[PDB]
Amino acid sequence: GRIYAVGGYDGSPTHLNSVEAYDPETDEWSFVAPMTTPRSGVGVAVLNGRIYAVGGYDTHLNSVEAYDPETDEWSFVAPMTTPRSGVGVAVLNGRIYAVGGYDGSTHLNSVEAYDPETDEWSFVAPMTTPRSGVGVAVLNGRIYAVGGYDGSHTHLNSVEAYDPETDEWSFVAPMTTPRSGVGVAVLNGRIYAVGGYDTHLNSVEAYDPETDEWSFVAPMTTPRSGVGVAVLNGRIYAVGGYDTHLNSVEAYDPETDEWSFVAPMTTPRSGVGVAVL
Ligand SMILES: [Ca+2]
Ligand SMILES: [Ca+2]
Ligand SMILES: [Ca+2]
Ligand SMILES: [Ca+2]
């Protein structure tokens, strides 16, 4: 029942290990325990009652830290094989998938899956297009890799969908606007691609997998690339990003098609990871 904003970069007048938690019922952000390693461009996902902070840039990181909210403690888990900043992370069928990113130790099309029951990462099928700054979300039994930057030199509007049952990636319909550093979340049977960089974007596009179509929805007030996006209590929250490095937070209600500001974080954060637990 909280949104966690994990790491990022405070470029206001620092790569962050700090973590803030938002309670929608009180409209308040509070600091929790910080991660060991500072991470900007970090991917964050939730599995089996832990937040996982995957990769990022401190050195480009293959390390992964897990947070237990019941104890307010972080601990390292097994590292990925490939270092990845600008990585997208999502959870499907009991695995965390780390998708793409940049290995500054290559823009990556490789994908690694983590099983918490074995504490092991393995490679699965790679995407067709390398993607750093990619948004990843899960809907109807597929992982969608949305946008990003292929520097193997294009900002991408293309979108690939992964089926774990076949271990295959397939292209779906592309977004209208190319978006790197895009935030992606899922609500009411649609994938929302929020902000990013084409021009720093306040526009938002929604994908219906049943029709294979993207449509624009209401734009955010503030343009945000490097934005973190998560879903809680029937709203999409767009957290931080770079317009100014932002500590502001906007909430989208799909039933009204409106964005509004909520309480800002204490620390401005671009390249921030955001998950709900
Ligand atoms: Ca509550
Ligand atoms: Ca527990
Ligand atoms: Ca299992
Ligand atoms: Ca299936």
Q: What DSSP character marks residue 9?
A: B
Q: Which residues are paired to 85 by β-bridges?
A: 102
Domain boundaries, the chain: 3-276
Residue 194: φ, ψ to 5°: -115, 120
What resolution in angstrom units was achieved for this structure?
1.5
The size of the chain, in residues, is 277
Residue 168: alpha-carbon gap to chain centroid: 21
Q: How far is the CA of 2 from the centre of ligand 1 (A)?
A: 8
187: CB partners within 8 A, 6+ apart: 231, 234, 235, 236, 254
193: CB partners within 8 A, 6+ apart: 135, 146, 147, 175, 179, 182, 183, 184, 204, 205, 206, 207, 214
Amino acid at 24: P
Q: Residue 138 CA: which ligand is closest? A: 4
How far is the first Cα of the chain from the last one, in angstroms, to the nearest whole number? 6
How far apart are alpha carbons 153 and 145 in whole angstroms?
18
At 13, list the tokens: 């007048």
Buried b (16+ CB within 10 A) or exposed e, 125-144: ebbebbbbbbbbbbbeebbb
Q: What does the angle CA 148 – CA 113 – CA 53 come to, to the nearest 5 degrees?
A: 70
At 257, list the tokens: 């098609």
Distances (CA, A) of 3 to 11, 174, 220: 22, 29, 19
Which one of 1.10.1660.10, 3.40.50.720, 3.20.20.70, 2.120.10.80 gives the CATH number of domain 3-276? 2.120.10.80
Q: How far is the CA of 218 from the centre of ligand 3 (A)?
A: 39
Q: How far is the CA of 95 from the centre of ligand 3 (A)?
A: 8
How far apart are alpha carbons 275 and 6 in whole angstroms?
8
Q: With beta carbons less than 8 A apart as the criterion, state whether 137 and 89 touch.
A: no
Q: Residue 93 CA: which ligand is closest? A: 3
248: CB partners within 8 A, 6+ apart: 222, 240, 261, 264
Q: How far is the CA of 80 from the centre of ligand 1 (A)?
A: 33
How far apart are alpha carbons 136 and 89 in whole angstroms?
6
